[PDB]
Amino acid sequence: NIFANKIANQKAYFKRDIKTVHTFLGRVNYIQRASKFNDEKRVFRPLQIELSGTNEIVDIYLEATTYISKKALDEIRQNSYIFLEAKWLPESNFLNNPLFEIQNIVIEN
Amino acid sequence: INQTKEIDVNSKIVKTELEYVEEDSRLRKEKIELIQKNYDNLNAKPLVG
Amino acid sequence: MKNLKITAIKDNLIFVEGEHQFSFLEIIKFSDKVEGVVLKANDRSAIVAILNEDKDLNLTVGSLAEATGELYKIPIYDNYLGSIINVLGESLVKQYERTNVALDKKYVFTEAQPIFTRSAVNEPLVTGITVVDGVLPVGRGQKELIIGDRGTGKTAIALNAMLAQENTDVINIFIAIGKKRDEIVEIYGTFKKHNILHKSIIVSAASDDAVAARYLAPYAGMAIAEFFQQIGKDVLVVMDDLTNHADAYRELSLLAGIAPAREAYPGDIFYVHSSLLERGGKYGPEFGGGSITILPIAQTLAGDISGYIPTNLISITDGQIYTSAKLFNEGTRPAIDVNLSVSRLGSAAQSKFMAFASSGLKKIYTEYKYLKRLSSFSSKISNRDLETLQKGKAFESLIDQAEYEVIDYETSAILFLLLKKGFLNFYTEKTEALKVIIGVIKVFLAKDVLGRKMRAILVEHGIDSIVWNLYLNHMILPLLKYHLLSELQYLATNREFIKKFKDIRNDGRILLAYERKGYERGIAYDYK
Amino acid sequence: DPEFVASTYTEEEIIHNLLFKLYSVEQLALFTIDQLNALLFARGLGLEKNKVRAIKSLLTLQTSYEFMEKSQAALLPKVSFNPTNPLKPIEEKEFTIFGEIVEIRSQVYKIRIDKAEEEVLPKVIFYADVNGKEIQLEVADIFDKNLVSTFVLGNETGLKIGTKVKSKNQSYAIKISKRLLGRVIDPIGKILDDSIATPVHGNMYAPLEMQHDSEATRYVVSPKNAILETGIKVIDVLLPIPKGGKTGLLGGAGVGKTVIVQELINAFIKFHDGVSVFAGIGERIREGHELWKEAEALGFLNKTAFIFGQMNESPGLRFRSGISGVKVAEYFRNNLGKSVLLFMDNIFRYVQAGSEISSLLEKTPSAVGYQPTLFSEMGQLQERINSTKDGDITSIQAMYIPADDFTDPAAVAAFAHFDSTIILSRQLAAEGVYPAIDPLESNSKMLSIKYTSREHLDIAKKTVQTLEKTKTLEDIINILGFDALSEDDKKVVEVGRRLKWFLTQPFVVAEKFSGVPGKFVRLKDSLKGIKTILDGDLNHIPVSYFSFVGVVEEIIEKFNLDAKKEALKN
Numbered sequence A: 001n002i003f004a005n006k007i008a009n010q011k012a013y014f015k016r017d018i019k020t021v022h023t024f025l026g027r028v029n030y031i032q033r034a035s036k037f038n039d040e041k042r043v044f045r046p047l048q049i050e051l052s053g054t055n056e057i058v059d060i061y062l063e064a065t066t067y068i069s070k071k072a073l074d075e076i077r078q079n080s081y082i083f084l085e086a087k088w089l090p091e092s093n094f095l096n097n098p099l100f101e102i103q104n105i106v107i108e109n
Numbered sequence B: 001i002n003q004t005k006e007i008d009v010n011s012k013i014v015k016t017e018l019e020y021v022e023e024d025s026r027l028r029k030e031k032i033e034l035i036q037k038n039y040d041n042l043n044a045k046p047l048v049g
Numbered sequence C: 001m002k003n004l005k006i007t008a009i010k011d012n013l014i015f016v017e018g019e020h021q022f023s024f025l026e027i028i029k030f031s032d033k034v035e036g037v038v039l040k041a042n043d044r045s046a047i048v049a050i051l052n053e054d055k056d057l058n059l060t061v062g063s064l065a066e067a068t069g070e071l072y073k074i075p076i077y078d079n080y081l082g083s084i085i086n087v088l089g090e091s092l093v094k095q096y097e098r099t100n101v102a103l104d105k106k107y108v109f110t111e112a113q114p115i116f117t118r119s120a121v122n123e124p125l126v127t128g129i130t131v132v133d134g135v136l137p138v139g140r141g142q143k144e145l146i147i148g149d150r151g152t153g154k155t156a157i158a159l160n161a162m163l164a165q166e167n168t169d170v171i172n173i174f175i176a177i178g179k180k181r182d183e184i185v186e187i188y189g190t191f192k193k194h195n196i197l198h199k200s201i202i203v204s205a206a207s208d209d210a211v212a213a214r215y216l217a218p219y220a221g222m223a224i225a226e227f228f229q230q231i232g233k234d235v236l237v238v239m240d241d242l243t244n245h246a247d248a249y250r251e252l253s254l255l256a257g258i259a260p261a262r263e264a265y266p267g268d269i270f271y272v273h274s275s276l277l278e279r280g281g282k283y284g285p286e287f288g289g290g291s292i293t294i295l296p297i298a299q300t301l302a303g304d305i306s307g308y309i310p311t312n313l314i315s316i317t318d319g320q321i322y323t324s325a326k327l328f329n330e331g332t333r334p335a336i337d338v339n340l341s342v343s344r345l346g347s348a349a350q351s352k353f354m355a356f357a358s359s360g361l362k363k364i365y366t367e368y369k370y371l372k373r374l375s376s377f378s379s380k381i382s383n384r385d386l387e388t389l390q391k392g393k394a395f396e397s398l399i400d401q402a403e404y405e406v407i408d409y410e411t412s413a414i415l416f417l418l419l420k421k422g423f424l425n426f427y428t429e430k431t432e433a434l435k436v437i438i439g440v441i442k443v444f445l446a447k448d449v450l451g452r453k454m455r456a457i458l459v460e461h462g463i464d465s466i467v468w469n470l471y472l473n474h475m476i477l478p479l480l481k482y483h484l485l486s487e488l489q490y491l492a493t494n495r496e497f498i499k500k501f502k503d504i505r506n507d508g509r510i511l512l513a514y515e516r517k518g519y520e521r522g523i524a525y526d527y528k
Numbered sequence D: 001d002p003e004f005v006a007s008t009y010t011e012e013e014i015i016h017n018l019l020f021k022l023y024s025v026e027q028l029a030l031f032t033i034d035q036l037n038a039l040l041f042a043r044g045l046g047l048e049k050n051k052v053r054a055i056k057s058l059l060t061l062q063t064s065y066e067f068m069e070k071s072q073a074a075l076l077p078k079v080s081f082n083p084t085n086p087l088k089p090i091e092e093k094e095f096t097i098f099g100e101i102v103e104i105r106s107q108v109y110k111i112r113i114d115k116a117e118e119e120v121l122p123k124v125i126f127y128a129d130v131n132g133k134e135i136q137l138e139v140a141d142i143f144d145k146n147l148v149s150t151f152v153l154g155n156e157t158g159l160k161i162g163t164k165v166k167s168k169n170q171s172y173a174i175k176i177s178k179r180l181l182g183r184v185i186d187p188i189g190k191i192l193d194d195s196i197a198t199p200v201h202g203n204m205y206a207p208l209e210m211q212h213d214s215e216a217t218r219y220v221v222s223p224k225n226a227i228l229e230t231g232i233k234v235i236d237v238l239l240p241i242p243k244g245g246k247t248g249l250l251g252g253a254g255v256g257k258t259v260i261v262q263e264l265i266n267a268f269i270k271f272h273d274g275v276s277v278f279a280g281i282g283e284r285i286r287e288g289h290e291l292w293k294e295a296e297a298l299g300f301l302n303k304t305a306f307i308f309g310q311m312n313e314s315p316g317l318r319f320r321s322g323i324s325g326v327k328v329a330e331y332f333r334n335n336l337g338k339s340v341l342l343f344m345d346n347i348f349r350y351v352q353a354g355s356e357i358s359s360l361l362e363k364t365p366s367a368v369g370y371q372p373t374l375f376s377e378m379g380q381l382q383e384r385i386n387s388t389k390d391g392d393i394t395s396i397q398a399m400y401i402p403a404d405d406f407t408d409p410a411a412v413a414a415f416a417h418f419d420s421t422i423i424l425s426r427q428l429a430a431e432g433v434y435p436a437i438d439p440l441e442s443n444s445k446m447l448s449i450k451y452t453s454r455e456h457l458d459i460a461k462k463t464v465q466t467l468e469k470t471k472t473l474e475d476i477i478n479i480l481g482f483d484a485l486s487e488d489d490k491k492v493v494e495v496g497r498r499l500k501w502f503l504t505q506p507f508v509v510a511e512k513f514s515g516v517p518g519k520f521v522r523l524k525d526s527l528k529g530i531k532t533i534l535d536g537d538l539n540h541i542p543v544s545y546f547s548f549v550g551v552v553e554e555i556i557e558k559f560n561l562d563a564k565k566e567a568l569k570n
């Protein structure tokens, strides 16, 4: 099985609170390093996702604030396949691409 | 009236900082791709052909 | 059924009358929720101290009570993990759900296990603090006291030690004695944020709780720790703090008619704490095979170590970490005084690699302090003056550490060896340099396919000088050199940096491609 | 629908809502100095002696999101705060326990119960009627079924053997409502501001009952996350006050704590638009009368609820003042959803009253003769101040340290709860420096990166470092002379002197002593002024110009004016 070894590498993170989320499901074509902007307290990660079923390229940004959120964000590499649920953040009004916060995510590498 | 109005600092800081983060990341990714292609072009020729 | 009647309610104690075979600390039930413990009793009556309080239950003279005929035993439930409980087991804040099936019931005054059930303390306990892990080691089964003034960072040090067990399979128990509920909720939030909530319990007795609850909270915590130890688990217990426990015991004894002794404390205040702290240690395979590590906290007044309770507690534990107010005012965090701090276990509590790495650093630190306080004239002895003024300052820069920052044991050892080999001479008080080095080493030893094996070798076996030199020269130094030259501009012209890193292999071509692939800033071979 | 939206508002509500009216800059330019000053005083920003600066201050206050939110809500139909978990009043009972006094002493009386419909509970109140006057006795110890011991809440004159007493088997209760604002009472609810004793209209609540369904409810709290703005340069820059925490005011006698307390009351009521509760414990009669009169004069009396346990009252009555104040604050937060700033003075007297009550009831004294339940009682008082979904309860408590002995058990008990300590110095006051707050000794837990910016932390750290270094160098200056310093040391000393004198500020309440009008300085203005001073920009100005000003520009303007006058004089 090609996907047999991918099961042992699953990493799942979730929140027990339920908000309105944007669901992304696909491969990570390109992911950059992390930037610290709000007084070196947050983490900014630009993501390029090739979705599933349409194979279109979308660009998003991810924000991390806690230690566990940064740990979950650090698991995303190139060619990683993700089922990510992201809460929209109101800072996208000053951004070219939307800024999101990880609510639930499942990561396989 | 003229002397009263002045440039705000909160919204300016937020917007400026966000645009700086986006420009910095775009510039870094361009420089990374050019640097790597330079490394590839430095060690990419057959010895004998 | 009820067999006792309340006769008097004074001094916050209840005077039950009835004919029964009372025993010390026997649970007496006044309702299905409220119960107390017997302190003193005779052939016709007893004096009881309540542990609970109920709004709908109005205890009064003539009320009925049942003497259950059983000693005070704390029950163990599965949902203790990731929860705040009180001394009777009720879950004040919970993350999971209970099953109403008691896994065990532990007597609170369980006598300490005898000498033949013990073992030597030889396995490190990671506290996440470089100075503590390298100069003041803590072994699994040790009793280390954190003693100091108010607002100096004792609770921060204990929480840091309790955060470093995120991936070590060591249970955490935090007993709060007369603490504020705001701070306890904040600690719960920090536990959840730092991924150790599923591994930790918090026993709480607030400052306005019943005096019996505040007195018996540490014993209930120790009973839970003993339950966990009996199935071969390493338990790390923090008591915050034992001065409040001494005050609670004094209040309970004074209100019960016991005569005051030195400093108004009862006459047996030393026994109360010794029989409590002697329940920790390392036990043999036939008697559980686990360990219990205790980190009691004590507060001094303006540096007065010679206080009654602080000197009682120093003469019980295996060393002390003393937090200085002068260093805290000067801005040093964590403000730990190395001169007044001891660890009687010593290198016996360190791994072989850490013992090799941190050998003879306290002497160099004391020499540096002696020179700094007595420089006197500008006349200089030799280059050894610069040697000391360099290595001591490098060590001092290594001392500083952010709050809630966990620095791994092997990362600390590697930093010590780099310092001792002169690979930090270029430092000129640029915190980002050490931050970069620490992050690179941490990621390399945690995620790299070959770095993970290197870390396992460092943890298990004791390597010699030649193998360590090969390890440093052929993997660690190229990675450090590349990741330093790409972030610090002044390192290009730093004469010491070239003098030390000239012959190191350049690895920019591969680390570039690793960065462009989204890899972390320490992977050098691949992800395991 | 103006008629409909105004139909949901009482006339007093409209009067209050006239404050949150937006004024355009075109209109604002047309006001005079007198109208601008009236607007500033109404909005709590303090007097201003310049036109454009006053317009800028008014615009900055108006452009704030909270002010705009209030102004936008003021033109809408009234929305009522729905109280979740309100305070329930006491239940209606009858006098069910009857008895009489059988033993007398100083402050302690024994009661033997004859006709009881139910067994007596701890802490219940027995009422006695002597010469038409009502005396309350709180129960302490129940010796057996029909014999209890009690201590007086008030005055013990008129009690004797055989005085009949009756009880409802309930603890002491007081009448609480919104009408408590503007009135002065004692812990048990006796009127203290007029001889005819006009009653307070409200419901009877028991301050000793917390009304919690379970203990777990006491752990549903929100840890402090916000900083209260006071308008005082030193407090804002160096010692941020938590919102929902506790700040201690420490010092000897005459350092100036009460003036700070009055200033904070005024600033919270006017600028922050809230409700203030004052709880005096062991309050001197002269000081209480003076503070009441100045509260009436300065205009913050109608939004303050005063509780006074006087110095001459029995220790049992003095002990209950803090509990009554806490109960009033809990009512004003839970029932009305208003943030409350509770003031306590003096905590040392609360501890002393507790010790007195413990000693009177024949209990074994603890160390230094204090009560065995010292820390327990301090926790009981301080644990009901917190921050919940309904609002914030901020506490600012003044303490007296005897002989500057910070290791006294009362002080050690108090520091266990303080979230920010402000320590006053008698030497600094004697130098004429006011508010005479010691910046080096005091510290706040809210001066971190979790709550403040990088700029604020950097400015605070640099200020403290400069002040400590100049304090060190002043001794060298005094001994060896100002010439012995190096070139950098002279600049450091001058910057430190100007920094120290810039931290002084005139208060709007302290106009009685020096006659100087007060000022209100925002956090940004103080930060900018300190940043200007730290760079050495104003190093060409004599130090005497930096004393008792509001903002950095006032010194520059005064120096320029003096230089112009000097140039014209010759």
Ligand SMILES: Nc1ncnc2c1ncn2[C@@H]1O[C@H](COP(=O)(O)OP(=O)(O)OP(=O)(O)O)[C@@H](O)[C@H]1O
Pocket (backbone or CB within 6 Å): C149, C150, C151, C152, C153, C154, C155, C156, C157, C333, C334, C401, C402, C403, C404, D445
């Ligand atoms: N490494 C650190 N870096 C920065 N701040 C720190 C560090 N460690 C502790 N602090 C801060 O120091 C203060 C005191 O810490 P802490 O509450 O742990 O001390 P304590 O000795 O337990 O005090 P208390 O007398 O209040 O019980 C807190 O504001 C905390 O955030």
Ligand SMILES: Nc1ncnc2c1ncn2[C@@H]1O[C@H](COP(=O)(O)OP(=O)(O)O)[C@@H](O)[C@H]1O
Pocket (backbone or CB within 6 Å): D251, D252, D253, D254, D255, D256, D257, D258, D259, D260, D434, D435, D507, D510, D513, D514
């Ligand atoms: N900001 C101030 N400006 C001028 N005088 C002050 C100020 N603060 C306090 N004082 C002085 O303090 C005296 C009253 O002391 P008080 O405020 O009762 O101090 P405490 O309550 O700490 O004993 C007054 O005579 C007054 O002159």
Ligand SMILES: [Mg+2]
Pocket (backbone or CB within 6 Å): C154, C155
């Ligand atoms: Mg603490």
Ligand SMILES: [Mg+2]
Pocket (backbone or CB within 6 Å): D257, D258, D345, D398
């Ligand atoms: Mg005063």
